[PDB]
Scaffold this motif. Structure first.
Motif, mmCIF file in Angstrom:
data_model
loop_
_atom_site.group_PDB
_atom_site.id
_atom_site.type_symbol
_atom_site.label_atom_id
_atom_site.label_comp_id
_atom_site.label_asym_id
_atom_site.label_seq_id
_atom_site.Cartn_x
_atom_site.Cartn_y
_atom_site.Cartn_z
ATOM 1 N N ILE A 189 0.743 -1.232 0.000
ATOM 2 C CA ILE A 189 0.000 0.000 0.000
ATOM 3 C C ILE A 189 0.786 1.304 0.000
ATOM 4 O O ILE A 189 0.511 2.274 -0.787
ATOM 5 C CB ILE A 189 -0.989 -0.176 1.144
ATOM 6 C CG1 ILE A 189 -2.357 -0.166 0.511
ATOM 7 C CG2 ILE A 189 -0.938 0.781 2.441
ATOM 8 C CD1 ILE A 189 -2.740 -1.465 0.090
ATOM 9 N N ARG A 190 1.768 1.405 0.887
ATOM 10 C CA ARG A 190 2.492 2.639 0.975
ATOM 11 C C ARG A 190 3.249 2.937 -0.312
ATOM 12 O O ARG A 190 3.711 4.109 -0.456
ATOM 13 C CB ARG A 190 3.493 2.660 2.179
ATOM 14 C CG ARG A 190 2.756 2.482 3.456
ATOM 15 C CD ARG A 190 3.769 2.032 4.575
ATOM 16 N NE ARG A 190 2.899 1.480 5.689
ATOM 17 C CZ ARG A 190 2.463 2.263 6.731
ATOM 18 N NH1 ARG A 190 2.891 3.551 6.876
ATOM 19 N NH2 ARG A 190 1.617 1.794 7.657
ATOM 20 N N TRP A 191 3.477 1.954 -1.217
ATOM 21 C CA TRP A 191 4.246 2.252 -2.461
ATOM 22 C C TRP A 191 3.218 2.300 -3.559
ATOM 23 O O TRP A 191 3.613 2.437 -4.702
ATOM 24 C CB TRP A 191 5.253 1.053 -2.764
ATOM 25 C CG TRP A 191 6.460 1.110 -1.856
ATOM 26 C CD1 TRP A 191 7.677 1.529 -2.189
ATOM 27 C CD2 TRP A 191 6.536 0.712 -0.465
ATOM 28 N NE1 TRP A 191 8.536 1.475 -1.083
ATOM 29 C CE2 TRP A 191 7.856 0.958 -0.020
ATOM 30 C CE3 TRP A 191 5.607 0.212 0.439
ATOM 31 C CZ2 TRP A 191 8.296 0.727 1.302
ATOM 32 C CZ3 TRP A 191 6.052 -0.080 1.833
ATOM 33 C CH2 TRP A 191 7.367 0.222 2.244
ATOM 34 N N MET A 192 1.878 2.259 -3.292
ATOM 35 C CA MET A 192 0.954 2.253 -4.414
ATOM 36 C C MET A 192 0.406 3.571 -4.805
ATOM 37 O O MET A 192 0.046 4.372 -3.942
ATOM 38 C CB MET A 192 -0.212 1.317 -4.031
ATOM 39 C CG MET A 192 0.347 -0.176 -3.984
ATOM 40 S SD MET A 192 -0.855 -1.419 -3.451
ATOM 41 C CE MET A 192 -2.319 -1.158 -4.486
ATOM 42 N N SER A 220 5.801 4.015 -7.822
ATOM 43 C CA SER A 220 6.411 3.283 -6.729
ATOM 44 C C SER A 220 7.876 3.721 -6.789
ATOM 45 O O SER A 220 8.597 3.673 -5.760
ATOM 46 C CB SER A 220 6.366 1.738 -6.969
ATOM 47 O OG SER A 220 5.064 1.238 -6.835
ATOM 48 N N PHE A 221 8.351 3.983 -8.007
ATOM 49 C CA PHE A 221 9.773 4.397 -8.064
ATOM 50 C C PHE A 221 10.043 5.679 -7.313
ATOM 51 O O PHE A 221 11.114 5.854 -6.689
ATOM 52 C CB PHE A 221 10.318 4.480 -9.442
ATOM 53 C CG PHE A 221 11.764 4.850 -9.456
ATOM 54 C CD1 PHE A 221 12.145 6.184 -9.686
ATOM 55 C CD2 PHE A 221 12.772 3.875 -9.178
ATOM 56 C CE1 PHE A 221 13.460 6.543 -9.747
ATOM 57 C CE2 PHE A 221 14.120 4.247 -9.173
ATOM 58 C CZ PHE A 221 14.487 5.538 -9.454
ATOM 59 N N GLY A 222 9.080 6.582 -7.350
ATOM 60 C CA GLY A 222 9.211 7.859 -6.660
ATOM 61 C C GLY A 222 9.347 7.416 -5.217
ATOM 62 O O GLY A 222 10.162 7.953 -4.449
ATOM 63 N N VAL A 223 8.490 6.518 -4.731
ATOM 64 C CA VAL A 223 8.594 6.111 -3.288
ATOM 65 C C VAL A 223 9.983 5.455 -3.041
ATOM 66 O O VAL A 223 10.576 5.720 -1.954
ATOM 67 C CB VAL A 223 7.429 5.231 -2.898
ATOM 68 C CG1 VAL A 223 7.499 4.838 -1.396
ATOM 69 C CG2 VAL A 223 5.969 5.962 -3.200
ATOM 70 N N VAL A 224 10.560 4.721 -4.041
ATOM 71 C CA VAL A 224 11.875 4.180 -3.932
ATOM 72 C C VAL A 224 12.945 5.235 -3.714
ATOM 73 O O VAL A 224 13.867 5.065 -2.882
ATOM 74 C CB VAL A 224 12.147 3.202 -5.055
ATOM 75 C CG1 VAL A 224 13.672 2.967 -5.203
ATOM 76 C CG2 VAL A 224 11.407 1.915 -4.727
#
Length: 299
Positions: free
Chosen positions: A196-199, A217-221
């Protein structure tokens, strides 16, 4: 009856199992020595996944996985070498990445790290800005590859990339992240566990997964790389995190992160999937910034 893969095979006796490296509900991962695998070094260390079942159905997945692994080969995808079916459990065989998963490697270089960290190949303590940007740029390159094949990863996060000697970073994992990092998933179903947190909101609201949801998700990466592996929204429960992503709130700039990196992350997080820059675009901007690292320092 379609064209199919062709997995290299490997003699059990050629695999000498050193010790366990990790364990999930379905698998153990070991460090091992493999003989005459690549014919110009005799011995070499590898990472060996051993499956816990041989059950009729759990067997045909292993092959379907092996095929797909053999087909995806690229410089920033963890190298798969092939398999061993001669008896039980089944073993999958990958290159060995000395430093483990990227989330762990990041935390072990955090200024919050409890202990220093060794290794001939990287300094202990926090990482140069050029190190972070090269870690980023490398994950982006695995992601350009996959997207070029039109594959969607669906679970990109630093726990699912791996770090080798010399700070080589490759997308790859052993299927155990829901066991080893079970708090980074929300169980919505019975057996159904969502990162969820990377969606993006459209993955959460419509359960639609695309190239563009991978780029979000990459931005979250990038945000994890810049916080030294912290979980996104860690103050928040899973339900609160969902309310956030869903009402449009975005993660705050980390204090290691220069404004030009925060900009990239921010183009990954456009509400509208099409307003998001391609992973090709992102990979160019990150590379350009890794060879020419902005001068940063913090307030």
């Amino acid at each position: 009856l379609v064209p199919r893969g062709s997995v290299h095979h490997i003699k059990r006796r050629d695999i000498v199992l050193k010790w366990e490296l990790g364990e999930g509900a379905f698998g153990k991962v070991f460090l091992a020595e493999c003989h005459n695998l690549l014919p110009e070094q005799d011995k070499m260390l590898v990472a060996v996944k051993a499956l816990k079942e041989a059950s009729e159905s759990a067997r045909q997945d292993f092959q379907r996985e092996a095929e797909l692994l053999t087909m995806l080969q690229h410089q920033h995808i963890v190298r798969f070498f092939g398999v061993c079916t001669e008896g039980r459990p089944l073993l999958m065989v990958f290159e060995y990445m000395r430093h483990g998963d990227l989330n762990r490697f990041l935390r072990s270089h955090g200024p919050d790290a409890k202990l220093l960290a060794g290794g001939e190949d990287v300094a202990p303590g926090p990482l140069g800005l050029g190190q972070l940007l090269a870690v980023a740029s490398q994950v982006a390159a695995g992601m350009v590859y996959l997207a070029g094949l039109h594959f969607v990863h669906r679970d990109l996060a630093t726990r699912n990339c791996l770090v080798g000697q010399g700070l080589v970073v490759k997308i790859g994992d052993f299927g155990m992240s829901r066991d080893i990092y079970s708090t980074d998933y929300y169980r919505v179903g019975g057996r159904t566990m969502l990162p969820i947190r990377w969606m993006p909101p459209e993955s959460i609201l419509y359960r639609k997964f695309t190239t563009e949801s991978d780029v979000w998700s990459f931005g979250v990466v990038l945000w994890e790389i810049f916080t030294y592996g912290k979980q996104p929204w860690y103050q928040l429960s899973n339900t609160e995190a969902i309310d956030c992503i869903t009402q449009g709130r975005e993660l705050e700039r980390p204090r290691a992160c220069p404004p030009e990196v925060y900009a990239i992350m921010r183009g990954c997080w456009q509400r509208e999937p099409q307003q998001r820059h391609s992973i090709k675009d992102v990979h160019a901007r990150l590379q350009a910034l890794a060879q020419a690292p902005p001068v940063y320092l913090d307030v």
